[PDB]
Amino acid sequence: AERIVVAGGSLTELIYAMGAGERVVGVDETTSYPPETAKLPHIGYWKQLSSEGILSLRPDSVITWQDAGPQIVLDQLRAQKVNVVTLPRVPATLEQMYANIRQLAKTLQVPEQGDALVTQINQRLERVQQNVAAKKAPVKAMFILSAGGSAPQVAGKGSVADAILSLAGAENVATHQQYKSYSAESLIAANPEVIVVTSQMVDGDINRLRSIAGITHTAAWKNQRIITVDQNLILGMGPRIADVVESLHQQLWPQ
Amino acid sequence: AERIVVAGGSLTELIYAMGAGERVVGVDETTSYPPETAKLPHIGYWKQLSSEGILSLRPDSVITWQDAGPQIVLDQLRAQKVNVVTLPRVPATLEQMYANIRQLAKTLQVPEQGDALVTQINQRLERVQQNVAAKKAPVKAMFILSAGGSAPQVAGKGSVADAILSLAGAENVATHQQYKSYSAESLIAANPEVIVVTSQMVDGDINRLRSIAGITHTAAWKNQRIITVDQNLILGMGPRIADVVESLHQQLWPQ
């Protein structure tokens, strides 16, 4: 058996979806799935690794993002003879995801499950893709997020959310890379048909969103076109991507 | 009492400040200070606890808020004969805080440390209080927070933030209870002279604040009276309360 500590929720999900979950003895705080990880200790963040926290778990290898840090912690772990493995989390494309899944499957010696997972996902996304092709006008949309105590921000090009919106058949109206805070005027002028937000933000009352500059004067709000998605499914590219793509696709073209 | 799992950031700080940090084996997601807790296993939000995540840590006692985690979990923790200690969180007042510091020092068998902490805190807060009376003009303020993945919300009555603004000598313009999302008109009506936000909200540049409905039309914004504060110092009443209060006071009345 192998002892693995993974830092990066998305990576933990991929590793479990490949039947290698059994080898995981630790995760970071951004890991919240699958449900069985709840029995594992959660230490640090991939953006803020803990040398002591990770080593206290006697890991054989550490799997995380290439830009995980601090870098000095990765050095420490390698000095401690720990096998550190990193994957690029940028760009947020299917090509990079599949490549990452494959790099993982190989590293963990489960290439078959790797290829299978890739197949399953691509096929499901493919269905939606053909279903969308049917339509004639990609729905102009936008995703607004609040994470890390930040003011609400619009998902830009390059973001995971943008990739998911595209795979679902929507055209992202944001014309900036990554996330940016939009003034009321900019949000209203973007004039998307639909606006997507997280369930975490909406909670039990749609009125909570009134503090988002300009959202109340958008066509989408007036026309009741405010879709809700689970924040845990739009921050990374995991095995559940097909699920959120499908769901999102239904809400973009109801009935 | 030998192996403690704390669910509640400020409670963790009080425990460490009272010299019992060694007995801590696990903390919750809202725990981020002191730095030595980073290497420890973290469970979920104290309001969404899992028997699994806590029990796996072999705790003797779980210290948290009277309204913490699902009741089914606490009952499961009790079934395992785990000593669950709860403190009142609701009255966000210095009286309740001191009463909590003493209850904690009691359960931790560190009474003299508790009394020493209450004394050091009270002396520094009273001093700010007399320096405030030395002032010559009251200040109307408001605190805006982004919690979890929620929209911008204004700290109202009964909130920790409101208690700190008061202690700092400012008058809170919000009169609603706890936290609520303000529309631009509401924020404009509130008419805050000064606005406090978190450093996590401003981070790079205060232009990220433009997505907060109505903020650019307030006096605080036009006159550049926007103060920043670490989120971790404004969500709980801990041993660093005097520091935040003094820092906030110093910014409300510069030089």
TrEMBL record, chains A, B:
Keywords of this entry: Heme, Iron, Metal-binding
Stretches assigned to the Fe/B12 periplasmic-binding domain: 3-255
Domain of life: Bacteria
Amino acids binding heme b: 10, 45, 65, 89, 160-161, 179
Keyword hit for Iron: yes
UniProt-recorded Gene Ontology molecular function terms: metal ion binding
Protein name as catalogued: Periplasmic binding protein
Gene designation per UniProt: shuT
Part of the full-length chain shown: 50 to 304 of 304
